[PDB]
């Protein structure tokens, strides 16, 4: 089955260039009558299409972005890339790669099917900071019935995003990872919580796995009940 | 210059009824109009193209109708799974998308479970104390969370974040984080989180004393 995977820097300094690469697998880009493109979505704005490229080297541009877009295809490694010059904060967004069906036949074809999962780009004048991870310890005060709540607190990181898993992916039922909030410090902060059978508290081990890719920070924090004295 | 609008911006829909939903174009676009579904954190998905044509792999509950300037996407027998944002896209000249409309689910009111967490000893080493209070699996989204320290209410020192509407049971969760400094976390002793909400007959207060 056809799949697209973006990869590219979480963080890029303003007045510089952003480059992303899509790696298509489960189908070949050449030879193929399909264009390959990038769409982006800034936080709390609509989707905006950027450019697409066809195996033949034909390039379909959004005109409002054309002057700043370089888009290319490496037919052998099954990869097309986007380069966007002189970026501003207006360029912070989730960038998706997609297959672009263009056709000028009987029934026009000008859509994107299917898409990749997006990658968050951030344009920031700043430096990456990795998170500090703190336990949200179970207590008598974090139980209701026979269910207990515990979690991790991922603080002071930049930029987004962090991924949080529990027990290296084993535990995924009852997990709630909240959207990051911006703090006054200018950094993000998040918190992941899971509800588990309180009968299991002292016997099952609960570890939160935090991964902040833009700074090669990985943290595993075991979550035990806070010394109750 | 074309311009795509959608209405309503957001829409709450009982599980099972039909959500009827619209796209409008400034000039006309004949039938060069697609619709996409975008569940949060997942990839967009083409629902319909041709302004009426269902893409392969799409249930017959989702149909598109319309032309020129007025289109409509309708989801009959709406499921809880369907909770996401829907964008339309005209292709008359080139790809332009609409602002999107968020489709929320309705369900019966559900009171939150309230849990509270004192700060980690590790964080207190650092100079800041974060107290967390959690409302789990409630409906609807609106909830008042007030902090009290020594029966002293607080202001401007707390932050919340709410999860996406759960695609299975259609509920929400919320976390409030009261941030203090290590010092004044010690100048006080009772940390309380008061919750008021539609599922509760009266407000409820989870609190702990420092050190149990």
């Amino acid at each position: 089955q056809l799949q697209l995977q973006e990869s590219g820097p979480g963080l890029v300094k303003p007045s510089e260039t952003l480059s992303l690469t899509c790696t298509v697998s489960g189908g070949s880009i050449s030879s193929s009558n399909y264009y390959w493109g990038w769409i982006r979505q800034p936080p709390g704005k609509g989707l905006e299409w950027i450019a697409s490229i066809h195996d033949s080297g034909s390039i379909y541009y959004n005109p409002s972005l054309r002057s700043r877009v370089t888009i290319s295809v490496d037919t052998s490694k099954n990869q097309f890339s986007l380069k966007l010059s002189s970026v501003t904060a207006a360029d912070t967004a989730v960038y998706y790669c997609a297959r672009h069906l263009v056709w000028f036949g009987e029934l026009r074809n000008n859509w994107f099917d299917p898409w990749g999962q997006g990658t968050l780009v951030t344009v920031a004048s700043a430096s990456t900071k990795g998170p500090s991870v703190f336990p949200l310890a179970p207590s008598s005060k974090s139980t209701s019935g026979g269910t207990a709540a515990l979690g991790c607190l991922v603080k002071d990181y930049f930029p987004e995003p962090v991924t949080v898993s529990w027990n290296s992916g084993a535990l995924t039922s009852g997990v709630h990872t909240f959207p990051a909030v911006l703090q006054s410090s200018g950094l993000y902060s998040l918190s992941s919580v899971v509800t588990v059978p309180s009968s299991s508290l002292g016997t099952q081990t609960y570890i939160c796995n935090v991964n902040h890719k833009p700074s090669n920070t990985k943290v595993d924090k075991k979550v035990e009940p806070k010394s109750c004295d | 210059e074309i311009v795509m609008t959608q209405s309503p911006a957001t829409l709450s829909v009982s599980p099972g009824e039909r959500a009827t939903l619209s796209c409008r174009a400034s000039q006309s676009v004949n039938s060069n109009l697609a619709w996409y579904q975008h569940k949060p954190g997942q990839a967009p998905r083409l629902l319909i193209y041709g302004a009426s044509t269902r893409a392969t792999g799409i249930p017959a509950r989702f149909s598109g109708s319309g032309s020129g300037t007025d289109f409509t996407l309708t989801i009959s027998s709406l499921q809880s799974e369907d909770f996401a944002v829907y964008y339309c896209q005209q292709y008359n000249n080139w790809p332009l998308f609409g602002p999107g409309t968020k489709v929320d689910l309705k369900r019966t009111v559900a009171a939150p479970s309230v849990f509270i967490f004192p700060p980690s000893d590790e964080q207190l080493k650092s100079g800041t104390a974060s107290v967390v209070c959690l409302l789990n699996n409630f409906y609807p989204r609106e909830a008042k969370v007030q902090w009290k320290v020594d029966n002293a209410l607080q202001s401007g020192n707390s932050q919340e974040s709410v999860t996406e509407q759960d695609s299975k049971d259609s509920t929400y969760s919320l976390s409030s984080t009261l941030t203090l400094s290590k010092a004044d976390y010690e100048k006080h002793k009772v940390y309380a989180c008061e919750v008021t909400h539609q599922g509760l007959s009266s407000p409820v207060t989870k609190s702990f004393n420092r050190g149990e």
Binding site: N33, H54, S56, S58, I59, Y60, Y61, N62, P63, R66, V102, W103, F104, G105, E106 | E1, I2, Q27, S28, V29, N92, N93, W94
Partner: peptide, 30 residues
């Protein structure tokens, strides 16, 4: 601004013109 701006391509590949006569005017075999 409708009815196919081909000006927003660098060139148009003859391969996606089908029978569209206006398309076949600009396009380029490869």
């Amino acid at each position: 601004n409708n009815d196919f701006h081909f000006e927003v391509f660098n060139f148009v590949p003859c391969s996606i013109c089908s029978n569209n006569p206006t398309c076949w005017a600009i396009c380029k075999r490869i």
